Coordinates of N, CA, C and O in Angstrom, one line a residue:
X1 N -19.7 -68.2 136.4 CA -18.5 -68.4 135.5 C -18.7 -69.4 134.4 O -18.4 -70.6 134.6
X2 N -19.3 -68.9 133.2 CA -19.1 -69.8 132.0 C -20.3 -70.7 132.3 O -20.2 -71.6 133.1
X3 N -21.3 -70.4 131.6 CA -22.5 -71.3 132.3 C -23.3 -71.1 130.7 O -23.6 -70.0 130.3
X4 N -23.7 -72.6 129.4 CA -24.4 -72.7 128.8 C -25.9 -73.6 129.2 O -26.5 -74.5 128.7
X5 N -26.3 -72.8 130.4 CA -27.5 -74.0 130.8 C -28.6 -73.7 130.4 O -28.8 -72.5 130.0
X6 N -29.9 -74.7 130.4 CA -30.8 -74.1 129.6 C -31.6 -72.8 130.6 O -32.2 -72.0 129.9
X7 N -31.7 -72.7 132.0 CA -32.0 -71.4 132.3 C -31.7 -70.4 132.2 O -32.1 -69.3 132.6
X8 N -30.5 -70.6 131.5 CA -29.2 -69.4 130.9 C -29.8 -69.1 129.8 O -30.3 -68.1 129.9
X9 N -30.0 -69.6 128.5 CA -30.3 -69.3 127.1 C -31.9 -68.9 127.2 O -32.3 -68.0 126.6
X10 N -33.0 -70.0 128.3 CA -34.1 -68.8 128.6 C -33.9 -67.2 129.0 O -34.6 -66.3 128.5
X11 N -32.8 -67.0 129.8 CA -32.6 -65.6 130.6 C -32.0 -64.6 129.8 O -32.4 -63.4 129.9
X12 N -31.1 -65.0 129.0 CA -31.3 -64.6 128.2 C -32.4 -63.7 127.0 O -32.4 -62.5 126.8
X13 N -33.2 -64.6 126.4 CA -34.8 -64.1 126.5 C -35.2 -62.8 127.0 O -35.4 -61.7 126.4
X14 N -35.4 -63.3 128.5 CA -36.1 -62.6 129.3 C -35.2 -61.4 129.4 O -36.1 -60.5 129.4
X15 N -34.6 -61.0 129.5 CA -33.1 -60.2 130.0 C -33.0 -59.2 128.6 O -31.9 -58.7 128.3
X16 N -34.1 -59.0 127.9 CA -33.7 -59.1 126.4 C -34.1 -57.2 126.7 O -35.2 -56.9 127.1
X17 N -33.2 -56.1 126.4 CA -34.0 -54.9 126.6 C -33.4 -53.8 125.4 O -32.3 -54.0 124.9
X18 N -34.5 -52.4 125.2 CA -34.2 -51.9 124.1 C -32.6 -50.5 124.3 O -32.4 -49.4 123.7
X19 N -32.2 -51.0 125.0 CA -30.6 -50.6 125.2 C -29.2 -51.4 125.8 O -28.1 -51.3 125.4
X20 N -29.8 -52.1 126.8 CA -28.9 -53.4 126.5 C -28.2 -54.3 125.9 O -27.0 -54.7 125.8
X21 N -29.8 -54.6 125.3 CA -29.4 -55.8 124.1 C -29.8 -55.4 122.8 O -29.5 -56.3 122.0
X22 N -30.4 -54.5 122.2 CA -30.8 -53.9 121.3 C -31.2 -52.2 120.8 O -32.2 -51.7 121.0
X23 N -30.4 -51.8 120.2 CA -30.9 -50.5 119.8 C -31.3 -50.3 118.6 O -30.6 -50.2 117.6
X24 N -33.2 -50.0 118.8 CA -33.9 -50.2 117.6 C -33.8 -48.7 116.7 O -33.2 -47.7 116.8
X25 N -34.5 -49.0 116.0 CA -34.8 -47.8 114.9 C -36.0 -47.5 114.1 O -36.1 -48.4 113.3
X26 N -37.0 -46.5 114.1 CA -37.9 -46.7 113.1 C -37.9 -45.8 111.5 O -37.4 -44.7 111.5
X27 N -38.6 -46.6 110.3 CA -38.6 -46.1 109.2 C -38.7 -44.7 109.0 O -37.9 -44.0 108.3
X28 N -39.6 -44.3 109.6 CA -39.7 -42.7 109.4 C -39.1 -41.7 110.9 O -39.0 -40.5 110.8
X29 N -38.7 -42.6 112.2 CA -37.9 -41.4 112.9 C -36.2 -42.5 112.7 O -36.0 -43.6 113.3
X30 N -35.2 -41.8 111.6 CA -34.0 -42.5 111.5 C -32.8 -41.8 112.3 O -31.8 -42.4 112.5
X31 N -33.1 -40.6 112.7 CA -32.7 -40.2 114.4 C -33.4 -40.0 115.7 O -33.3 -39.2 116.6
X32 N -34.7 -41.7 115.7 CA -35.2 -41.9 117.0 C -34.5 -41.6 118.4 O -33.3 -41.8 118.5
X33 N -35.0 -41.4 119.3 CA -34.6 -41.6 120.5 C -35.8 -42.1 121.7 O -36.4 -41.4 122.3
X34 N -35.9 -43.5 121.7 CA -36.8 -44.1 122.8 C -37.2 -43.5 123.8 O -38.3 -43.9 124.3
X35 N -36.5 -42.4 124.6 CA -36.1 -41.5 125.6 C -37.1 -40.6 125.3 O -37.1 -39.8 126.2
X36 N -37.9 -40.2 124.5 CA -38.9 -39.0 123.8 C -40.3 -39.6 123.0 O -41.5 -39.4 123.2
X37 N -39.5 -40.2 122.2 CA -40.7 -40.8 121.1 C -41.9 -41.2 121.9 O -41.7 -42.1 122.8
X38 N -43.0 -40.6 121.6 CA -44.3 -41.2 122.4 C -45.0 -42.6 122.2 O -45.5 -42.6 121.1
X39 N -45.2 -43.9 122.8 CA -46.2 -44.9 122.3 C -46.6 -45.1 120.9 O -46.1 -45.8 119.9
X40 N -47.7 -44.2 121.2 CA -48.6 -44.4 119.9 C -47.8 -44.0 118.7 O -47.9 -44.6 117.6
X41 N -46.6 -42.7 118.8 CA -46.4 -42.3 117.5 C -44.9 -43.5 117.2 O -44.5 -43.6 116.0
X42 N -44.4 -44.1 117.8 CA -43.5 -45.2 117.6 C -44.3 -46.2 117.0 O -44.1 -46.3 115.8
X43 N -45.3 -47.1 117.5 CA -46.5 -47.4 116.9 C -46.7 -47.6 115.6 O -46.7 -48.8 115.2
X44 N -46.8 -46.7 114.9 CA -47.0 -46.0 113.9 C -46.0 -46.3 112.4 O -46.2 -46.0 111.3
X45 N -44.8 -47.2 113.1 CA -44.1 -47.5 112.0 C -43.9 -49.2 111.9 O -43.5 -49.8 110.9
X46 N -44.1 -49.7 112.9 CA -44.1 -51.1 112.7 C -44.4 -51.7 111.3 O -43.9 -52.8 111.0
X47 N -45.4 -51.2 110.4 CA -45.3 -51.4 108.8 C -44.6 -50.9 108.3 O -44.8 -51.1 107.1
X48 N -43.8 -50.1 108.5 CA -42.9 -49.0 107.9 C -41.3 -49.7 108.2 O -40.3 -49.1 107.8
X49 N -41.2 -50.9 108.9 CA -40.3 -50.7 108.7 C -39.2 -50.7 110.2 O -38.9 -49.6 110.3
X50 N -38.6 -51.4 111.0 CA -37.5 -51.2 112.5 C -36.1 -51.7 112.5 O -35.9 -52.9 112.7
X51 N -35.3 -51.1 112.4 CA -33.5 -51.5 111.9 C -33.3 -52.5 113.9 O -33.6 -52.1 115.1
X52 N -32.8 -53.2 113.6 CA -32.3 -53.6 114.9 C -30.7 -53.9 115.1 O -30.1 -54.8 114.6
X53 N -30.2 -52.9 116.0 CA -28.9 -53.2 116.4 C -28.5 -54.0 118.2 O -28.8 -53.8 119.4
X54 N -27.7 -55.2 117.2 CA -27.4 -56.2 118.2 C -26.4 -55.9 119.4 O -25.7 -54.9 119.4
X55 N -26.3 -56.5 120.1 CA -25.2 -56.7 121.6 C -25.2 -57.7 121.9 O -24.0 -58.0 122.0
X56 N -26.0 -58.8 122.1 CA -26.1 -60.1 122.6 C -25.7 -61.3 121.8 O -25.3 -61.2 120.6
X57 N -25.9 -62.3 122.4 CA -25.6 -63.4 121.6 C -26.3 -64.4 120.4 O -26.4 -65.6 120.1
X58 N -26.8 -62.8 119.8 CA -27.7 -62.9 118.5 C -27.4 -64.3 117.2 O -27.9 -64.4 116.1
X59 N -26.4 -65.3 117.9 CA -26.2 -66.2 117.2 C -26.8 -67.6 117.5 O -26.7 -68.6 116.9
X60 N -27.4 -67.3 118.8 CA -28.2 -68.3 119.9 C -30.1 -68.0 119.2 O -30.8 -68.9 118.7
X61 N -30.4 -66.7 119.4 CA -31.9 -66.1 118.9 C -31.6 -65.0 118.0 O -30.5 -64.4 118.1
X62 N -32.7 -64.8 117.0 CA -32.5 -63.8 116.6 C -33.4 -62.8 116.8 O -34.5 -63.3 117.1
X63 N -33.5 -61.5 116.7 CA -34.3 -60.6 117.2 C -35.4 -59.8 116.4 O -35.1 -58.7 115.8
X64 N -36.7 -60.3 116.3 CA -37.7 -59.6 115.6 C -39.1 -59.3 115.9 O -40.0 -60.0 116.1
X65 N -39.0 -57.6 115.9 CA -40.4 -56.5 116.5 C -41.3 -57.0 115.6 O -41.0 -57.0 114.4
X66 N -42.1 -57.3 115.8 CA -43.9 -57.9 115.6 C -44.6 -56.0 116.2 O -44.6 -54.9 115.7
X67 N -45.0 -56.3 116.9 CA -45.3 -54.9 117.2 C -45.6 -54.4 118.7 O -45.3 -55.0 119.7
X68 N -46.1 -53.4 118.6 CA -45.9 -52.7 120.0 C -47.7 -52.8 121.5 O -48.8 -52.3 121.2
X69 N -47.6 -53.3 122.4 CA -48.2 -53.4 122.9 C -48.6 -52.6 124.2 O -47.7 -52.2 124.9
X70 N -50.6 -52.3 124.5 CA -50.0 -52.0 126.1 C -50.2 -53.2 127.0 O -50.4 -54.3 126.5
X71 N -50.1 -52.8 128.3 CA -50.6 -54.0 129.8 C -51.5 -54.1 129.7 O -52.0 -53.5 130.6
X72 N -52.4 -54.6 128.8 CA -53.8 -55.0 128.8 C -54.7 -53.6 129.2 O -55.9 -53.5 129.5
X73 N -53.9 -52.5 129.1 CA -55.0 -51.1 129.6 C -54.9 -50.5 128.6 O -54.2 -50.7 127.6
X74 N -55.8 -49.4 129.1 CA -56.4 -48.2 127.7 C -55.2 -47.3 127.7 O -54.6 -46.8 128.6
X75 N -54.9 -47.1 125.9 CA -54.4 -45.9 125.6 C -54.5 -44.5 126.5 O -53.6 -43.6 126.1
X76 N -55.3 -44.0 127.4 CA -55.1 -43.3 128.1 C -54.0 -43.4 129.4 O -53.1 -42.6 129.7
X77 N -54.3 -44.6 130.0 CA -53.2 -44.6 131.1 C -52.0 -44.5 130.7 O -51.0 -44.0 131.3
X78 N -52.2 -45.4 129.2 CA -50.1 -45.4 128.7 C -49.2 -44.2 129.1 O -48.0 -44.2 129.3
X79 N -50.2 -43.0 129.1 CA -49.3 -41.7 129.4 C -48.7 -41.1 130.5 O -47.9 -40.2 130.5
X80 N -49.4 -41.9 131.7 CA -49.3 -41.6 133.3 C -48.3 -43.2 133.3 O -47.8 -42.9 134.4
X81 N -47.9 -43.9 133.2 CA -47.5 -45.3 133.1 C -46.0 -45.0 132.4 O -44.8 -45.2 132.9
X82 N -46.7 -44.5 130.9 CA -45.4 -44.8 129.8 C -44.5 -45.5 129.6 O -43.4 -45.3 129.3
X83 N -45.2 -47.0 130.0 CA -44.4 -48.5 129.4 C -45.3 -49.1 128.6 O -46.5 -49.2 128.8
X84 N -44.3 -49.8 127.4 CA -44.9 -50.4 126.4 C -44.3 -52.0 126.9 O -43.6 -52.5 127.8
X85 N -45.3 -52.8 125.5 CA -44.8 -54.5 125.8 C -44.3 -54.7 124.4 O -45.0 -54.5 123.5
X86 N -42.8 -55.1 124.2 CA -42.3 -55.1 122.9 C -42.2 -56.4 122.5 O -41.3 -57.2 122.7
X87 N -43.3 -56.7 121.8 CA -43.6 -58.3 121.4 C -42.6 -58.5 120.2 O -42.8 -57.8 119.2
X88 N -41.4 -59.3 120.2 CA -40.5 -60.1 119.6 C -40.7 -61.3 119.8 O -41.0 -61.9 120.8
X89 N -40.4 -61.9 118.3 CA -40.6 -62.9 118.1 C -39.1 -63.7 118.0 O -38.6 -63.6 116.8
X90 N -38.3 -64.5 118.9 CA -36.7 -65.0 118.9 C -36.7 -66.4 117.6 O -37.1 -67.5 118.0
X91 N -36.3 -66.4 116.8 CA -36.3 -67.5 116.1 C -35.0 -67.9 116.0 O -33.9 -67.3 115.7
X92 N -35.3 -69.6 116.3 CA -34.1 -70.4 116.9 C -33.3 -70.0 115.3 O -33.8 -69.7 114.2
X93 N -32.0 -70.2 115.6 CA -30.9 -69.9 114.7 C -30.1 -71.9 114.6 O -29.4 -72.4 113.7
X94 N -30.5 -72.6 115.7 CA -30.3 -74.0 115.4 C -31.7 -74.8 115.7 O -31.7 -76.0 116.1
X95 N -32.7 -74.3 115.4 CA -34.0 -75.1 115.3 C -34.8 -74.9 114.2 O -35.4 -75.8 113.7
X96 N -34.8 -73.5 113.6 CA -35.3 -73.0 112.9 C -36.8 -72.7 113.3 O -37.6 -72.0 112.6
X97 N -36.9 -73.0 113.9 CA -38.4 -72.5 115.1 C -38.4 -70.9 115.9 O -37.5 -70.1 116.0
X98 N -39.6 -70.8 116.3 CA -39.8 -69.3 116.7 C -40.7 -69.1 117.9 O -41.9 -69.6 117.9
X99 N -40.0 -68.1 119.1 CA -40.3 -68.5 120.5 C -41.2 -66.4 120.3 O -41.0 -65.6 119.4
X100 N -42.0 -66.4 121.2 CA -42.4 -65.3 121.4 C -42.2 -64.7 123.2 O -42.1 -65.3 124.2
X101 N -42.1 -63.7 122.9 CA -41.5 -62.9 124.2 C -41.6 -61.2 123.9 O -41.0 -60.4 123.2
X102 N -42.7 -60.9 125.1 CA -43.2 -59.9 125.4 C -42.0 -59.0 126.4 O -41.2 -59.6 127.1
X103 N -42.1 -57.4 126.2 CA -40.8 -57.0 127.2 C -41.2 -55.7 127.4 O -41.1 -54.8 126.6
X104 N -41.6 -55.7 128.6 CA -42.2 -54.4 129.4 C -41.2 -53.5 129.7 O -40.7 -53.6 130.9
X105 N -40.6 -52.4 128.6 CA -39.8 -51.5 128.7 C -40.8 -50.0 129.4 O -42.0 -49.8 129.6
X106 N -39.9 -49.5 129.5 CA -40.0 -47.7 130.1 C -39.3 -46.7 129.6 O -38.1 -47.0 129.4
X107 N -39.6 -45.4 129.3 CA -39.0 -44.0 129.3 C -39.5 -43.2 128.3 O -39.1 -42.1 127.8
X108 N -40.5 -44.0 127.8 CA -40.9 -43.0 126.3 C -41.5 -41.4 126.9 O -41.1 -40.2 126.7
X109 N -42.8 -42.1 128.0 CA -43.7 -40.3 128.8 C -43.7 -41.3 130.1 O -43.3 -42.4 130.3
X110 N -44.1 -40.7 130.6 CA -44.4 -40.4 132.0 C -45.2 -39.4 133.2 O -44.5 -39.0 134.2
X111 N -46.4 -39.0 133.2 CA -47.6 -38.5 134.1 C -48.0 -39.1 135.3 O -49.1 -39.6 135.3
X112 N -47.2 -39.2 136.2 CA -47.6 -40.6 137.7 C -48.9 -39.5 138.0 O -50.1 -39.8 138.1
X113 N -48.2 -38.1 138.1 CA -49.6 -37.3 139.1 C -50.0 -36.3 138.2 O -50.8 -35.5 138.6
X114 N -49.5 -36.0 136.8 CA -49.8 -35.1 135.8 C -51.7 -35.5 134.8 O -52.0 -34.9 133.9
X115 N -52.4 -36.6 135.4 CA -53.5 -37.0 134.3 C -54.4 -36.7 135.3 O -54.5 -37.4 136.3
X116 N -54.9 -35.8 134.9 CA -56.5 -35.6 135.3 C -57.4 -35.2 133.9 O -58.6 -35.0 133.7
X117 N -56.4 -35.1 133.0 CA -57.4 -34.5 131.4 C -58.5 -35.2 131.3 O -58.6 -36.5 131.5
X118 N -59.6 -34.2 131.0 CA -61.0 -34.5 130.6 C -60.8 -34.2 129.2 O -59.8 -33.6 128.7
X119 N -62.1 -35.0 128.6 CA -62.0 -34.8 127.0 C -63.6 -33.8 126.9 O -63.8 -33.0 126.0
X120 N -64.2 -34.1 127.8 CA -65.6 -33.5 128.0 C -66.8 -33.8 129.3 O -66.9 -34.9 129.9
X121 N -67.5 -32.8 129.3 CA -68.6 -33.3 130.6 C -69.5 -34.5 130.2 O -70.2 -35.0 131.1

């Protein structure tokens, strides 16, 4: 009930996700849907350009995509997995300073038992 503490304005942060607290957009898909768009081809516009729509208390941090990451694994697994790490950068709104924060979303693909593709013998 009514709590400004500081493990609250961290959790915040952390709590930070791309339907919750933000629904992004990219330059060249401007009827995206995160629910389809593949990794790599979302990827692909981070110089191009990401609209961000707020929910939270975007007057505490503010919200900005740096770019798209995997778990330290190969672009092959991303597709049996299909979670990215969405490196945002929160910059204080009364510090003027800037915190970084990685966020391991899901639903772009998904293959748990669909990857056995060979590319060659």
């Amino acid at each position: 009930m009514l709590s400004q503490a500081n493990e609250d304005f961290k959790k915040i942060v952390n709590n930070i996700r791309l339907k919750d607290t933000f629904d992004f957009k990219l330059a060249a898909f401007p009827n995206q849907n995160y629910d389809q768009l593949l990794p790599s081809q979302i990827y692909k516009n981070y110089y191009q350009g990401i609209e961000i729509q707020q929910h939270k208390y975007q007057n505490e941090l503010d919200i900005k995509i740096i770019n798209f990451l995997y778990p330290d694994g190969d672009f092959g697994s991303a597709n049996k997995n299909g979670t990215l790490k969405l490196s945002l950068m929160l910059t204080d709104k009364k510090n003027n300073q800037v915190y970084y924060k990685l966020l391991e979303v899901s639903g772009f693909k998904s293959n748990p038992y669909l990857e056995h593709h060979h590319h060659h013998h």
